[PDB]
Amino acid sequence: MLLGGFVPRRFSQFNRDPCWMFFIFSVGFWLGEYPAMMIKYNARDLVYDPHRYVWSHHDDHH
Amino acid sequence: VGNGPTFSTGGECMNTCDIQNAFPMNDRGVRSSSPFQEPNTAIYDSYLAWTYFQPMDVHIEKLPAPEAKYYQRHTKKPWDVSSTELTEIQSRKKYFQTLGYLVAFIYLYFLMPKEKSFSGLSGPDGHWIMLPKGRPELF
Amino acid sequence: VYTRWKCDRLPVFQLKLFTQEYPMHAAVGIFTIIFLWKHMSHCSEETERKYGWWAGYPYWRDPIARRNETKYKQMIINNDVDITHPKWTGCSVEQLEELSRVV
Amino acid sequence: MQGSWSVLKKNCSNFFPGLLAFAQQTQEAYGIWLRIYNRQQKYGPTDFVEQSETFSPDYHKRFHSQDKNMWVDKELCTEVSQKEVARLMTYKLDMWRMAHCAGALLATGGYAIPFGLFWLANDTWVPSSFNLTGEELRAWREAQDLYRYRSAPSYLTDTKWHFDFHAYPWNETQERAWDDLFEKNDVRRDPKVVRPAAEMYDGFIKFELIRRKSLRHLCRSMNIPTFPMLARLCNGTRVRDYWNLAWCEDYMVITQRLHESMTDEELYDYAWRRYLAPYDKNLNREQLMERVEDYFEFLGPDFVAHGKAPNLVILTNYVLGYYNDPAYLEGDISELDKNDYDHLASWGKDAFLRRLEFENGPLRDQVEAHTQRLLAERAAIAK
Amino acid sequence: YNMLVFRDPKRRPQLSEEERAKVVVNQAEWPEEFKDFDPDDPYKNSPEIIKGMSSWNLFLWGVECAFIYQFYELVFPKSI
Amino acid sequence: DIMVPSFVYNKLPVIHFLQEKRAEQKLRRVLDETYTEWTEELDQAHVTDAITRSLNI
Amino acid sequence: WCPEVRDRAELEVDITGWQWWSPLEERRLLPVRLRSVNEVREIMSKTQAKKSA
Amino acid sequence: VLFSTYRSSRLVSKEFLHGPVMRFRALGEYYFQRAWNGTLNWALPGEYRLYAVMIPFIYFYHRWHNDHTLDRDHVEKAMIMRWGGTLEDVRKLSAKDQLRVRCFTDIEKLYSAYGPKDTYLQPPGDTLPGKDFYR
Numbered sequence A: 001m002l003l004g005g006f007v008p009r010r011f012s013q014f015n016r017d018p019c020w021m022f023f024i025f026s027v028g029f030w031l032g033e034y035p036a037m038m039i040k041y042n043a044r045d046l047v048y049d050p051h052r053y054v055w056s057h058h059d060d061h062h
Numbered sequence B: 001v002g003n004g005p006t007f008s009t010g011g012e013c014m015n016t017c018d019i020q021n022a023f024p025m026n027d028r029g030v031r032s033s034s035p036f037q038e039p040n041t042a043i044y045d046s047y048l049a050w051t052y053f054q055p056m057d058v059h060i061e062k063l064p065a066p067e068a069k070y071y072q073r074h075t076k077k078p079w080d081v082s083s084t085e086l087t088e089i090q091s092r093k094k095y096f097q098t099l100g101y102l103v104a105f106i107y108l109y110f111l112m113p114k115e116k117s118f119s120g121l122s123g124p125d126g127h128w129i130m131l132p133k134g135r136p137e138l139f
Numbered sequence C: 001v002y003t004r005w006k007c008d009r010l011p012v013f014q015l016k017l018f019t020q021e022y023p024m025h026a027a028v029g030i031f032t033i034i035f036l037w038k039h040m041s042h043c044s045e046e047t048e049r050k051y052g053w054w055a056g057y058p059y060w061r062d063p064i065a066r067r068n069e070t071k072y073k074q075m076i077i078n079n080d081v082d083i084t085h086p087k088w089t090g091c092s093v094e095q096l097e098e099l100s101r102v103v
Numbered sequence D: 001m002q003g004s005w006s007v008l009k010k011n012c013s014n015f016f017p018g019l020l021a022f023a024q025q026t027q028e029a030y031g032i033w034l035r036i037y038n039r040q041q042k043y044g045p046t047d048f049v050e051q052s053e054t055f056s057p058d059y060h061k062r063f064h065s066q067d068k069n070m071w072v073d074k075e076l077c078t079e080v081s082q083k084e085v086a087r088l089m090t091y092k093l094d095m096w097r098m099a100h101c102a103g104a105l106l107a108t109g110g111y112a113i114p115f116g117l118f119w120l121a122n123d124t125w126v127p128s129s130f131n132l133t134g135e136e137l138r139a140w141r142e143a144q145d146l147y148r149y150r151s152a153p154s155y156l157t158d159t160k161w162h163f164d165f166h167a168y169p170w171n172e173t174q175e176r177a178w179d180d181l182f183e184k185n186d187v188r189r190d191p192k193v194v195r196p197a198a199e200m201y202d203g204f205i206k207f208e209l210i211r212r213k214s215l216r217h218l219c220r221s222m223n224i225p226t227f228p229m230l231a232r233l234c235n236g237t238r239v240r241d242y243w244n245l246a247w248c249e250d251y252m253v254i255t256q257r258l259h260e261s262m263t264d265e266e267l268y269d270y271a272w273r274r275y276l277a278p279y280d281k282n283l284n285r286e287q288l289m290e291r292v293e294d295y296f297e298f299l300g301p302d303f304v305a306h307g308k309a310p311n312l313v314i315l316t317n318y319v320l321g322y323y324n325d326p327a328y329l330e331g332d333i334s335e336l337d338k339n340d341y342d343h344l345a346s347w348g349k350d351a352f353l354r355r356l357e358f359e360n361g362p363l364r365d366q367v368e369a370h371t372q373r374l375l376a377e378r379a380a381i382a383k
Numbered sequence E: 001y002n003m004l005v006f007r008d009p010k011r012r013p014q015l016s017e018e019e020r021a022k023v024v025v026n027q028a029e030w031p032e033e034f035k036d037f038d039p040d041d042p043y044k045n046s047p048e049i050i051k052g053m054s055s056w057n058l059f060l061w062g063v064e065c066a067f068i069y070q071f072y073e074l075v076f077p078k079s080i
Numbered sequence F: 001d002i003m004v005p006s007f008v009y010n011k012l013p014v015i016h017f018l019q020e021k022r023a024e025q026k027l028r029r030v031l032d033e034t035y036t037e038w039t040e041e042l043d044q045a046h047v048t049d050a051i052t053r054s055l056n057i
Numbered sequence G: 001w002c003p004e005v006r007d008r009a010e011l012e013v014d015i016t017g018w019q020w021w022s023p024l025e026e027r028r029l030l031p032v033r034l035r036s037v038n039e040v041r042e043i044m045s046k047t048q049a050k051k052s053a
Numbered sequence H: 001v002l003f004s005t006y007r008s009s010r011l012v013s014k015e016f017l018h019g020p021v022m023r024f025r026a027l028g029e030y031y032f033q034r035a036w037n038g039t040l041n042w043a044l045p046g047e048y049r050l051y052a053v054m055i056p057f058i059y060f061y062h063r064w065h066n067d068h069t070l071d072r073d074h075v076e077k078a079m080i081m082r083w084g085g086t087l088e089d090v091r092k093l094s095a096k097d098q099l100r101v102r103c104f105t106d107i108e109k110l111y112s113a114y115g116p117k118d119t120y121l122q123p124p125g126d127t128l129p130g131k132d133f134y135r
């Protein structure tokens, strides 16, 4: 019902309560996974599967 | 003073509730969070207003202990279970239920394989049951 | 004092709740359960192949065929069924032997 | 009362003698009821004999009407004695329970045997005839009183809560009557003060409009079996018949002052059948006489004058109020010196709890003043 | 103030202006955690749960966990 | 485990308040029924006068 | 340690009385309070006059 | 007579496992039994920290389940169909090849309906294997 509880004023205060510490850890995971996907899935050495035209979900569900 | 809880409020403001009259009002004009008398009751304003009571060390003139005759009522019945006993029972039951649910959650979301896998490496593909046995005349 | 929720045990309270508090709802629920298990409790093999698998039916191993093979082997072995009987084959045993020698 | 092996052995030993005694009582009670029914059919009012229909104003559902479908035979003493009426009432209770058991047996064939074992292990639903000695009868009466204690408070609370939530009394005297009606048995209720509640509830609800759940609670409190309850007009009929017999006997006693000459045990039984005197209270003759006189006073002069009793719902509440014992309280007051949340002491206070303690603690005024002054200064600077 | 949808509760004043003006403030009696108390930043001086563990350190820990989750298979791939 | 307990908890305050008011009403009724009964007794002057008359004075 | 409240609440809930507000009973009992001494004097005078008449 | 219908018929002593139960209740009560923890129909509490702690945990375990149990099936199907149509054929490949294929599947998932269609539509004149390669 969002009535009350500890509310950090800014980022630096997230370490003043264990629950908000876990919350900021989770936020870091969430936001840092995206750059990892950028680096991994836009890599120069990434190569499409040669047999990608052999089969696809589009023909399966059709 | 201790960190213990108090009479529950449900996140409601007693100065505007439908049963506000049941909550005593102190000198400052703040109705109590409980049927008891509270001197330091306060109101906090989030999106919704809610009443709060902060426990404190206060001395109250304690009337001398009466006799057991004038407050004890020995009308207990076999079916009767006291609130304290009920709380104990429920605490134990919920502890065991919590352990069981924790085990179940772990097994489901980290160990139990999904049925009917494409590769066949994990999970069962299903099978028949209730098949007849020792009934040659059936065929 | 006595109260059903506080004094009675869980099964007793369940029976009381669904017999003297919500009996009609329980009756309707049982009726609906019976209907569901009587008319919505079957799935053909083709339906299973189309929609019965998360990623699609793995035709490269055909687990349905293996399942039915195990079922029929178990039934035959346990019930002592002679699958060479003329009714199963539509021809006499001697004709079956002649066909085996032919092919 | 919970079942036990001793009671099981008692009932198993006395099973066949109990059945034989029940059959003899059945013959006697059939004779008594034949007399009573013939008298009712011959001298009864036209509405009572013809079973006049009284429908509710909301859903037009027929139910017995206290004024029309209940009749007090003032001249029944000529044909039937008070003791015969009491015997008939007791046999009616026993026959109801036996009939329910027999119906279960007929329905379920031989599969009711374990349920019969459960039945014989408890005296709650066995007939009085199964007790062949004084101690067994005392235990049986104790079980019946326990069931009454278990059931009555629910009925009283249902009535009181529904009325108070959906209506209020008109005048002060009605308010006092309503408040004093539902007092615990540890205090004595004045029937004169309580009587107007009957008229008030007649204004609210009559016996013809009694709801099925309240009827179930009442039948539980009257040791009347409720399963299968079925429609409300069956156990309602049972209740009407029982209270009509009780009213006839009460009129007979009042007119002939039989209770004064009635012996101690018979007086106790008479009060018990009215749900006035529990056996576990070990009441003496003085208390029994006081309660009986209060009951007669509650019935009022109009009962003798015209055979019209007050509202049956309020009468049942009043009589069952003697089974509404004070709420139990066990434990020395010293127990209040303990603490309930010691297990949380190890956790201490977090930042938010410390802030709340600081703001709302003994220094609350100073913090409030400082905060308000700072906010005012900031607002002034902003402007 | 607010942090996303979470709003900091504010205690309603209970004293009137006349009574409030007569209150003498003595911060010497206040706890060290709450001195120069500011409603807009009441937890500025609040102690850290773990000494030397900053919020940014936890954020970086989560980011490193994400990087591990996404890159471990690249270094230690496993067969089907 | 959850619902009935919560509603009982919600009921508690109003019932406590009403029962306190009822007890106060009982005490008030007890007090209001108290009246001091001042009795009047035959003045002894008449008795003295009768005594004088009996003496034939 | 306040058994009457407990019993009443439990019974009200067990009989389908979920509601926790009783405006009518409160209205009947809200203005109840112990009387002042002068009020007691007036009531006693009224009672004495009634008894005399 | 065999079993009691009343909860009052205890099966254990009042002190059985008192300490662990008290610890569990201390865990339960510290954050929940507060005035500001006003629930909405018992499902939505008023304590912010409860949200802050529970949302990430729920998401984490759900995502772990989905990744290691649900999408794995689709990934394996893609690998099998595109590289022989049999599990052994896929196992004939090296771990690095499987990694490449699975990451391409992740690429396809990310593109979804908002990306180039050459990932599954073979342009005319392309020299790569077609659908009948293994047939």
Ligand SMILES: CCCCCCCCCCCCCCCCCC(=O)OC[C@H](COP(=O)([O-])OCC(O)COP(=O)([O-])OC[C@@H](COC(=O)CCCCCCCCCCCCCCCCC)OC(=O)CCCCCCCCCCCCCCCCC)OC(=O)CCCCCCCCCCCCCCCCC
Pocket: C030, C033, C034, C035, C036, C037, C038
């Ligand atoms: C020893 C037991 C008693 C023996 C018999 C005694 C004497 C007779 C009793 C009364 C018989 C009634 C006859 C029918 C009357 C009219 C209704 C009707 O049309 O019925 C159709 C049909 C009966 O067929 P039929 O008309 O006799 O003729 C055959 C036709 O040729 C068939 O033609 P069809 O086209 O209708 O066929 C489709 C299919 C139709 O079948 C169905 O649709 C099945 C419907 C089942 C309904 C169950 C009702 C009770 C539900 C309680 C609430 C459950 C909530 C959800 C729980 C989910 C998680 C478990 O028919 C069947 O194959 C019937 C098989 C019925 C098997 C019943 C098994 C019950 C299992 C209950 C498990 C409960 C688990 C709780 C665990 C809790 C743990 C904490 O189904 C039923 O009657 C269903 C109700 C049966 C009730 C039996 C008595 C009570 C239960 C006793 C067994 C308890 C076992 C517990 C095991 C626990 C394991 C952990």
Ligand SMILES: CCCCCCCCCCCCCCCCCC(=O)OC[C@H](COP(=O)([O-])OCC(O)COP(=O)([O-])OC[C@@H](COC(=O)CCCCCCCCCCCCCCCCC)OC(=O)CCCCCCCCCCCCCCCCC)OC(=O)CCCCCCCCCCCCCCCCC
Pocket: D060, D061, D062, D063, D230, D231, D232, D233, D234
């Ligand atoms: C294993 C066994 C399985 C058994 C299955 C069978 C069913 C269960 C059996 C019985 C279970 C026990 C409990 C039953 C309910 C008890 C109710 C109660 O407490 O009543 C007290 C009540 C006593 O109170 P009272 O104060 O003396 O009198 C009541 C007051 O009048 C009350 O005053 P009021 O102010 O309330 O007055 C109103 C009152 C007035 O009513 C009464 O109370 C009077 C008595 C009832 C009269 C009913 C007949 C009315 C005239 C029918 C005319 C039909 C013409 C058709 C011509 C067709 C030509 C082609 O109520 C009405 O107005 C209701 C009228 C009935 C309406 C029926 C609507 C049906 C709609 C159908 C829809 C479509 C269906 C599907 C499609 C079908 C076609 C394809 O009892 C009665 O009055 C009679 C009770 C009768 C009990 C049922 C007997 C069952 C016999 C079963 C034999 C067959 C067994 C088959 C076994 C199969 C193998 C297993």
Ligand SMILES: CCCCCCCCCCCCCCCCCC(=O)OC[C@H](COP(=O)([O-])OCC(O)COP(=O)([O-])OC[C@@H](COC(=O)CCCCCCCCCCCCCCCCC)OC(=O)CCCCCCCCCCCCCCCCC)OC(=O)CCCCCCCCCCCCCCCCC
Pocket: D026, D029, D030, D033, D095, D096, D097, D098, D099, D100, D101, D102, D103, D104, D106, D107, D228, D234, D237, D238, D241
């Ligand atoms: C073999 C076939 C079986 C078929 C399946 C049966 C399945 C079981 C169902 C139940 C059957 C009955 C069980 C025995 C009951 C005992 C007899 C009796 O009525 O006791 C009086 C008593 C009457 O109660 P009440 O409330 O005082 O009556 C108000 C009247 O205003 C009372 O009027 P009143 O105020 O003027 O007072 C009169 C009173 C004045 O008298 C007295 O006061 C003297 C005492 C008389 C009664 C004595 C009862 C003794 C009971 C105990 C017996 C010994 C048990 C021993 C057990 C251990 C054995 C080792 O005398 C009476 O009690 C007379 C009542 C009217 C007669 C009812 C009997 C009708 C059926 C019999 C004839 C059948 C003919 C078939 C022809 C076939 C043609 C093809 O019965 C009850 O307690 C009621 C039964 C309670 C259980 C109900 C269960 C549900 C029933 C639903 C039935 C629906 C239709 C059937 C289909 C079912 C499908 C699901």
Ligand SMILES: CCCCCCCCCCCCCCCCCC(=O)OC[C@H](COP(=O)([O-])OCC(O)COP(=O)([O-])OC[C@@H](COC(=O)CCCCCCCCCCCCCCCCC)OC(=O)CCCCCCCCCCCCCCCCC)OC(=O)CCCCCCCCCCCCCCCCC
Pocket: C011, C012, C015, C016, C019, C027, D001, D002, D003, D100, D101, D102, D104, D105, D112, D113, D115, D116, D117, D118, D119, D120, D121, D122, D124, D125, D227, H001, H002, H003, H004, H005
């Ligand atoms: C030789 C004798 C003389 C001749 C015979 C005479 C006639 C005798 C018969 C008549 C007797 C009538 C009086 C009876 C009184 C006693 C009744 C009673 O039971 O009292 C409770 C009685 C104790 O009474 P008490 O202690 O004296 O307390 C009485 C109080 O006053 C408490 O009182 P209360 O009022 O609070 O209690 C009432 C409570 C009574 O209930 C209970 O208390 C519940 C009893 C069961 C509790 C079970 C708990 C334990 C569960 C264990 C589960 C399994 C565990 C694992 C086992 C592993 C094994 C390897 O609630 C109810 O009354 C609910 C009624 C529900 C009615 C249901 C109606 C359904 C209708 C369906 C809908 C139809 C709609 C119309 C459709 C129309 C369609 C056309 O309970 C027990 O003793 C418990 C027994 C448990 C036995 C073990 C567990 C079950 C074993 C099953 C074995 C199955 C084997 C075959 C399996 C085959 C598989 C294929």
Ligand SMILES: CCCCCCCCCCCCCCCCCC(=O)OC[C@H](COP(=O)([O-])OCC(O)COP(=O)([O-])OC[C@@H](COC(=O)CCCCCCCCCCCCCCCCC)OC(=O)CCCCCCCCCCCCCCCCC)OC(=O)CCCCCCCCCCCCCCCCC
Pocket: C010, C011, C014, C015, C016, C018, C019, C020, C023, C024, C026, C027, D100, D101, D103, D104, D107, D108, D111, D125, D216, D225, D226, D227, D228, D229, D230
């Ligand atoms: C956490 C999980 C735990 C485990 C959970 C387990 C799973 C449960 C899931 C589902 C639960 C909810 C189900 C609800 C269904 C819908 C109910 C409904 O609509 O009710 C409406 C409605 C509600 O009843 P009510 O009268 O308004 O009040 C109910 C209150 O509970 C009355 O309360 P009260 O306080 O007013 O009265 C208290 C006291 C008041 O005292 C008395 O009344 C005195 C004593 C009376 C004794 C009984 C008299 C019966 C008279 C005849 C009744 C008519 C018979 C009709 C013909 C026979 C039909 C079979 O009565 C009693 O103590 C009653 C004792 C009954 C004990 C038996 C309870 C069942 C235990 C299990 C035994 C059977 C197991 C079979 C399956 C296993 C087989 C291997 O039902 C009725 O009108 C009753 C009709 C009864 C007809 C007979 C039963 C038909 C059902 C099939 C029986 C099959 C027997 C098989 C034998 C063995 C074969 C091998």
Ligand SMILES: CCCCCCCCCCCCCCCCCC(=O)OC[C@H](COP(=O)([O-])OCC[N+](C)(C)C)OC(=O)CCCCCCCCCCCCCCCCC
Pocket: C031, C032, C034, C035, C038
């Ligand atoms: C891809 C295709 C999609 C198609 C989707 C179609 C919609 C599906 C929707 C399903 C979900 C919603 C379900 C809602 C509930 C529907 C209920 C329904 O229709 O059920 C009917 C069905 C009808 O049953 P039935 O189909 O077995 O009917 C038998 C009729 N004969 C024999 C002629 C074939 O009910 C049941 O299945 C339950 C029956 C048992 C319970 C009732 C027993 C008592 C019956 C009393 C009358 C007869 C006996 C005499 C009196 C009693 C004597 C003791």
Ligand SMILES: CCCCCCCC/C=C/CCCCCCCC(=O)OC[C@H](COP(=O)(O)OCCN)OC(=O)CCCCCCC/C=C/CCCCCCCC
Pocket: H001, H002, H003, H004, H009, H010, H011
């Ligand atoms: C009814 C049985 C009749 C025949 C005699 C069988 C005796 C078998 C040997 C039993 C030895 C162990 C007994 C231990 C004490 C059991 C106590 C008991 O039953 O309590 C039930 C108790 C629950 O009690 P509440 O409902 O909470 O309240 C009870 C108070 N009303 O149940 C339990 O906890 C389970 C206890 C199970 C004990 C073992 C029972 C075995 C019964 C077997 C019967 C079948 C015949 C066996 C023949 C054996 C021949 C060598």
Ligand SMILES: CCCCCCCCCCCCO[C@@H]1O[C@H](CO)[C@@H](O[C@H]2O[C@H](CO)[C@@H](O)[C@H](O)[C@H]2O)[C@H](O)[C@H]1O
Pocket: D037, D038, D039, D041, D042
């Ligand atoms: C399976 C069925 C089981 C049934 C169980 C119950 C049976 C009860 C039988 C009761 C018989 C009573 O006997 C009957 O009583 C009535 C009332 O006195 C008599 O009735 C007689 O007097 C009345 C009253 O003046 C007249 O209205 C009536 O016209 C006249 O016949 C009958 O003449 C007599 O036959």
